[PDB]
UniProtKB/Swiss-Prot annotation, chain A:
CDD domains reported in the protein's UniProt record: Ubl_ATG8_GABARAP_like
Gene Ontology terms describing biological process: autophagosome assembly; autophagosome maturation; cellular response to nitrogen starvation; glycophagy; mitophagy
Keyword Plastid annotated: no
Subunit structure: Interacts with ATG13, OPRK1, RB1CC1 and ULK1. Interacts with TP53INP1 and TP53INP2. Directly interacts with SQSTM1. Interacts with ATG3, ATG7 and MAP15. Interacts with TECPR2. Interacts with TBC1D5. Interacts with MAPK15. Interacts with TRIM5. Interacts with MEFV and TRIM21. Interacts with WDFY3. Interacts with the reticulophagy receptor TEX264. Interacts with UBA5. Interacts with KBTBD6 and KBTBD7; the interaction is direct. Interacts with reticulophagy regulators RETREG1, RETREG2 and RETREG3. Interacts with IRGM. Interacts with DNM2. Interacts with NCOA4 (via C-terminus). (Microbial infection) Interacts with Kaposi's sarcoma-associated herpesvirus protein VIRF-1.
Gene Ontology molecular function: beta-tubulin binding; GABA receptor binding; phosphatidylethanolamine binding; phospholipid binding; Tat protein binding; ubiquitin protein ligase binding
Protein name: Gamma-aminobutyric acid receptor-associated protein-like 1
Organism: Homo sapiens
UniProtKB/Swiss-Prot annotation, chain B:
Residue span relative to the full protein: 384 to 393 of 393
Outcome of mutating residue 9 to A: Decreased phosphorylation, leading to decreased hydrolase activity and autophagic flux. Does not affect interaction with ATG8 family proteins
Domain notes: The LIR motif (LC3-interacting region) is required for the interaction with ATG8 family proteins MAP1LC3A, MAP1LC3B, MAP1LC3C and GABARAPL1. Required for proteolytic activation and delipidation of ATG8 proteins.
Protein name: Cysteine protease ATG4B
PTM summary: Ubiquitinated by RNF5, leading to its degradation by the proteasome. O-glycosylated by OGT, leading to increase protease activity, thereby promoting the proteolytic activation of ATG8 family proteins.
Domain of life assignment: Eukaryota
Gene: ATG4B
Family to which the UniProt record says this protein belongs: Belongs to the peptidase C54 family.
Motif LIR per UniProt: ranges: 5-8
Sequence positions bearing Phosphoserine: 9
Function according to Swiss-Prot or TrEMBL: Cysteine protease that plays a key role in autophagy by mediating both proteolytic activation and delipidation of ATG8 family proteins. Required for canonical autophagy (macroautophagy), non-canonical autophagy as well as for mitophagy. The protease activity is required for proteolytic activation of ATG8 family proteins: cleaves the C-terminal amino acid of ATG8 proteins MAP1LC3A, MAP1LC3B, MAP1LC3C, GABARAPL1, GABARAPL2 and GABARAP, to reveal a C-terminal glycine.
Localization terms from the record: Cytoplasm; Cytoplasm, Cytosol; Cytoplasmic vesicle, Autophagosome; Endoplasmic reticulum
Length: 115, 10
């Protein structure tokens, strides 16, 4: 029951129209909404909505987020999707297939704590 | 950045 602002700020039917449009316009990409888990002691990620190549790996996405938020490299970083932590070698396309919500978006939280 | 979604590559 993690809140995401894009969900908090728009009704379902608006989101689903928008996810379906973008999936129609970019069939080899997936739309992903990323937010820091609340009260995780890591920097916030300012840009929250991404259109990502389906073949991009979780680990590649980690590396992009780490750079953007200036995470020190001793610090850990984990994705949460529906309370699970995906394998670093999973693709974002597979993560989307397995977890996208009914508005056709994938919602990803992150923290430097896995537990 | 199409429709406020940041387009990533790779």
């Amino acid at each position: 029951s993690m809140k995401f602002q894009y969900k908090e700020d728009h009704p379902f039917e608006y989101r689903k129209k928008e996810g379906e449009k973008i999936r129609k316009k970019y069939p080899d990409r997936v739309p992903v909404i990323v937010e820091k888990a609340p009260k995780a002691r890591v920097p916030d990620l300012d840009k929250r909505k991404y259109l990502v190549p389906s073949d991009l790996t979780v680990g590649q996405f980690y590396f992009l987020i780490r750079k953007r938020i200036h995470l020190r490299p001793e610090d850990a970083l984990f994705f949460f999707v529906n309370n699970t932590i995906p394998p670093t070698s999973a693709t974002m396309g597979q993560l989307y297939e397995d977890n996208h919500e009914e508005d056709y978006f994938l919602y990803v939280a992150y923290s430097d704590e896995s537990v | 950045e199409d429709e406020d979604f940041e387009i990533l590559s790779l």
